[model samples]
Target: DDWRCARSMHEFSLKDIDGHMVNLDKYRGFVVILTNVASQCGKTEVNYTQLVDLHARYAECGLRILAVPCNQFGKQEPGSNEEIKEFAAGYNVKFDMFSKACVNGDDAHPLFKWMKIQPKGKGILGNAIKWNFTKFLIDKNGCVVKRYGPMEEPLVIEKDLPHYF
Candidate 1:
């Protein structure tokens, strides 16, 4: 949580599902899709499927998908690493996934806190993340490019990735 001075996505670090620290800088020079995922949301199937497909489509081109499990929406992802594995087994989630963390409120993860402040270029900046599946697209430089609402599918976000890659 000490990443208070972090200026870009790469400056922060998060824990993996295994409770190990992971530096975001590993994604440097890669276009990253940083998203809050909930296993039980209505959009879970579609979003997870599309994310996998999207990764397969652009991974060779340096597209990286980072999925962070959050239960703040409706307690959809309330569980530990074992449960995360159980939930993730349903989808062929090949992308990177991190330990569950808060994306809103004072207890929010440092990375999410940084992402929420980024400009979406489409809406007035609101401080709170509305729902699960909310996504932040980061350029290769590890700076957020755009924020996508929960309703916008990964395919829709693909429209913006081309600009970065």
Candidate 2:
């Protein structure tokens, strides 16, 4: 399923940091930045900071970030949802950080399953997520347009962001 697109922006929901279910359909026609985040990962600081910056800069228009924490990788992000919320708050991340969800294996979140199926990479084509911090960029029309590896800097994505309305 490496070629599966989001199909529709109308088909997504996730529990936010506050424990309330968020209807992503509310953000239809908006660019969405969805990432599998981890606290102890090497790029934690940069990813956190830059993503916040991006969220702040474009949120008003339609740039929404759905950060789903996962602890599957080396026990990183071992904290509970409350802890993750506090950490993200301290980092000034105002984006919608969702409930912790398994982003890999057979038990991976359904949203993630759909995301990983979207085409990604320069060397291989697979539905498997290689590692933590893999990112998918969804355009305003709900099309999954880009797949970024863990090593890519979040700040570098600024050029690819759609202009604010």
Candidate 3:
């Protein structure tokens, strides 16, 4: 109950890899999947590809996947924004990719700080991003619907996506 708050995902803003500011409020009426990504993670390829698939499959249906690279886990993402962009480009990722940021600890991004505390399965062990690829699925109303662990592939989360559409 410590990090619980009435804040909606729309209240946060972050810079994309291109250095442009993105306001989450712009996606207020759409389903948004926010995930912390790491290029060097073993899960990178599958997750990236699946995310691209999900984006291509659901963008017209109001789904937006926001990928934010974080170096907090094992230094797995130490690249600069350009390198991060190039890495994602290699995976043919078309979804929005943000610059690297801390997904945990005192310096974590505000959006991440908010997401980490959201209720997850059984409502426990939901406040920390255990590793790369931790995901938070948000509904059209900006409420976090579920928290998927690092290993929960995007397609697995896709099965439940239409319910919110």
Q: Write the per-residue lDDT of candidate 2 for residues 71-126, one digit (tens) a residue.
A: 88788899999999999989988888888988777887666777666544222555
Query: For residues 26-124, what per-residue lDDT tens digits would candidate 3 score against the true structure?
Result: 898899998999989999889998999999989999999999999988899988999999999998888899878887788888777777666542225
Q: Is candidate 1 or candidate 3 better by lDDT?
A: 1
Local accuracy by lDDT, each model:
0.85, 0.77, 0.85
| Residue 69 in model 3: lDDT | 92
Best-fitting candidate, scored by lDDT? 1
TM for every model, in the order presented, reads: 0.93, 0.87, 0.92
Superposed model 1: Cα runs more than 4 Å off = 1-4, 121-125
Superposed by TM-score, candidate 2 places the C-alpha of residue 101 at a distance from the truth, in angstroms, of 0.1
Candidate 1 lDDT: 0.85
List, residue by residue over 103-141, the lDDT tens digit for candidate 1: 989899978877776665133556688899988889888
Instruction: Sum up the clashes in candidate 1.
Output: 0
RMSD of each: 1.8, 3.1, 2.5
Q: Report model 2's TM-score to 2 decimal places.
A: 0.87
lDDT score at residue 89, model 2, on the 0-100 scale: 88
Provide the lDDT at 88 for model 3.
93
